[PDB]
Amino acid sequence: MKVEEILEKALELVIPDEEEVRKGREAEEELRRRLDELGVEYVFVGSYARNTWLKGSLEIDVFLLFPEEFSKEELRERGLEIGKAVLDSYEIRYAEHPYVHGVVKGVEVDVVPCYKLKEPKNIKSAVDRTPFHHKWLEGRIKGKENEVRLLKGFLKANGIYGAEYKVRGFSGYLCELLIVFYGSFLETVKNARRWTRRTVIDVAKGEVRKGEEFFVVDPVDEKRNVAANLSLDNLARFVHLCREFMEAPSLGFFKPKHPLEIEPERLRKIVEERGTAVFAVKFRKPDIVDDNLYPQLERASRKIFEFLERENFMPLRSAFKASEEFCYLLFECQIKEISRVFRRMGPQFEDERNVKKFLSRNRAFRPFIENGRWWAFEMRKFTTPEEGVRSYASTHWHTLGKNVGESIREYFEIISGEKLFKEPVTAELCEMMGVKD
RNA sequence: GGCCGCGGCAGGUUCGAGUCCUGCCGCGAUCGCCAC
């Protein structure tokens, strides 16, 4: 009921249980056993090493430390060969430079090669920042681990946790910085309410000042923004969430939300009461990781949104969805039908040459002068939003993002009305329209 | 690998288009971002 007891109740939700903690130490003792077996210099980093890792989020990260006499050549190769002999099931994923994902005694493991460096300079790759982040926090985070998890869980419940493009929220490392800055979970929430889009937080300097952008200065890298990939709208949501919490704090703030799935009938009544045009672009999911797909579905939805906008259909909102098979680009427009004719602007009556040319073109209706310049009645190729997007997506598929636009080129369909409500987009359509209980 | 920001080239549209379409090359050796 009070603020005090809520935070402790919530702890249970964010804190790994002992057998989860246990899973991690065994896999840590074995890993550390295999490298001391193969005698490589290393360091453990990340949420696990700082004991800040979130419940059910367990991942062991291990950085392999190479002298600077080497290059990517010994890094890529002999960074892979070390992973194979230790990891049980090795899945090789990529980054700027490739690393080795996998498992050891049930626990997930990431093994990332890098340089043995002094000081936070000569830093090129972003995988190089990672161990220095740890050295910095390791000392300042000791004892505040639980405050960190509280912040993380609060965010992850509201869907803004993590910096991947699927989220564009607050990265874990950023959370750790905040608690080190504001001292605890609560004070962060207390303080976040007063943040602005121009807020600069210099962690290392104990300073908050006004910038050109919302900026968290990496203690390690004074030029880098730890908050770089946080979207404005997600910061706006966080500030909005912090205020709500302080006004009326409840445990609900730490509990993951319902999708709000609605029945297609009641949903049929809403769309008809709004009297809007609700339609969707359906196509097969490109086989690509989400951090490619999602940024593209964002772009695709934008290019088409701007189109309906440019085309005077008065779009309201756009969304998207990724199922296992299909991807959906969602739209709602104020305009279900527009007239066949419009007004193109002509040249000023004074302008001889350009007027002769404007008045020559074959048009079904006679042009006219209004406010000292010529206007003509013209004819659009499509009178409805669904028609224009068919037209637009078909010709312009290539600007819809590489991989998404390519699948849209090789197939796609426009859904609306009852067939639309049959698709597994019902939750998204609700958020888009802002449907209540 | 993709997104994003720029720079350049050739074509389209339009009465005209530095602002829109289109495709191409280049750029991120002071870090753009994401493999959370």
Side-chain angles (χ1 to χ4, degrees), chain A residues 39 107 129 290 347 390:
Chain A
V107 187
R129 312 198 199 103
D290 287 352
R390 181 196 307 111

Side-chain angles (χ1 to χ4, degrees), chain A residues 2 4 19 32 89 101 190 195 274 287 291-292 388:
Chain A
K2 189 169 193 301
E4 304 169 328
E19 59 280 9
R32 176 170 282 96
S89 63
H101 194 69
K190 193 188 296 179
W195 288 357
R274 296 169 139 271
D287 200 24
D291 291 319
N292 303 3

Side-chain angles (χ1 to χ4, degrees), chain A residues 387-426:
Chain A
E387 286 175 2
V389 176
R390 181 196 307 111
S391 167
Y392 173 81
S394 302
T395 66
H396 289 98
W397 57 266
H398 198 294
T399 188
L400 298 186
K402 184 183 176 192
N403 305 108
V404 164
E406 278 163 22
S407 172
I408 281 175
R409 179 206 39 221
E410 62 207 7
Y411 157 80
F412 84 102
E413 181 185 355
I414 301 294
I415 321 301
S416 73
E418 321 292 338
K419 181 162 175 163
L420 181 55
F421 305 152
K422 287 175 183 175
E423 307 286 337
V425 296
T426 56

Side-chain angles (χ1 to χ4, degrees), chain A residues 39-307:
Chain A
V40 192
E41 189 175 9
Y42 60 84
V43 56
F44 286 66
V45 304
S47 50
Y48 180 84
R50 298 176 220 123
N51 195 45
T52 63
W53 84 88
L54 200 58
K55 182 171 188 58
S57 296
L58 174 63
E59 200 171 33
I60 292 176
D61 297 332
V62 185
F63 271 68
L64 310 173
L65 301 181
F66 288 102
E68 291 185 55
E69 288 68 1
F70 298 106
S71 53
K72 171 180 169 57
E73 305 158 1
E74 284 287 313
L75 252 64
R76 180 182 61 83
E77 185 186 352
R78 299 298 182 84
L80 157 66
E81 294 304 307
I82 292 173
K84 281 186 177 184
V86 180
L87 290 286
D88 303 341
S89 63
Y90 47 83
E91 173 200 27
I92 283 68
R93 259 121 80 167
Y94 291 89
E96 192 60 18
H97 292 90
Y99 71 101
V100 185
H101 194 69
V103 180
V104 173
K105 299 184 71 173
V107 187
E108 292 191 327
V109 173
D110 297 326
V111 179
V112 190
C114 72
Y115 288 102
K116 187 177 67 181
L117 303 183
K118 293 177 175 183
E119 282 267 336
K121 255 289 169 76
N122 288 249
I123 296 175
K124 289 198 169 180
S125 308
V127 299
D128 298 332
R129 312 198 199 103
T130 305
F132 284 138
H133 292 162
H134 176 64
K135 307 295 166 51
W136 195 82
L137 281 167
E138 166 189 69
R140 315 170 198 272
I141 208 70
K142 174 173 177 176
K144 286 294 174 62
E145 288 84 357
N146 289 2
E147 298 294 346
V148 182
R149 290 177 167 105
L150 284 172
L151 168 59
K152 292 185 168 178
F154 175 75
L155 295 160
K156 180 160 174 278
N158 303 261
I160 50 174
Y161 173 59
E164 72 269 16
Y165 273 117
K166 181 172 181 171
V167 191
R168 292 180 150 278
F170 303 58
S171 65
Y173 174 57
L174 178 56
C175 301
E176 302 183 351
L177 286 187
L178 289 165
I179 306 308
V180 173
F181 190 88
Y182 284 120
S184 58
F185 163 76
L186 204 164
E187 274 302 331
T188 303
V189 168
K190 193 188 296 179
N191 281 270
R193 301 179 298 174
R194 299 293 152 78
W195 288 357
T196 70
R197 64 194 60 198
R198 302 209 173 181
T199 300
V200 176
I201 305 179
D202 196 328
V203 183
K205 294 194 180 192
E207 200 184 34
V208 175
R209 62 184 176 274
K210 177 182 167 297
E212 46 193 350
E213 271 216 347
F214 173 83
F215 204 102
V216 188
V217 177
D218 202 334
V220 168
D221 196 342
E222 148 236 299
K223 195 63 251 170
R224 205 231 164 191
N225 190 335
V226 182
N229 202 39
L230 172 59
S231 71
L232 177 62
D233 288 338
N234 288 340
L235 154 63
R237 283 176 197 96
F238 183 62
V239 174
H240 174 60
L241 286 173
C242 285
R243 290 172 178 177
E244 286 178 333
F245 187 72
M246 286 295 101
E247 293 278 299
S250 81
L251 189 56
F253 287 77
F254 300 76
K255 291 177 173 168
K257 307 301 177 299
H258 284 323
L260 183 64
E261 303 292 350
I262 195 171
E263 59 274 31
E265 176 62 23
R266 173 188 163 204
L267 187 52
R268 180 198 59 85
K269 285 186 169 73
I270 289 172
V271 170
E272 285 177 1
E273 279 187 9
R274 296 169 139 271
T276 59
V278 189
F279 59 100
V281 177
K282 182 184 177 173
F283 58 94
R284 302 182 193 276
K285 166 175 169 161
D287 200 24
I288 53 173
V289 301
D290 287 352
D291 291 319
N292 303 3
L293 180 66
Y294 265 100
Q296 296 174 63
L297 291 167
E298 282 167 7
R299 159 165 219 184
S301 181
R302 175 178 88 247
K303 293 295 292 175
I304 293 172
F305 185 101
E306 279 167 347
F307 158 75

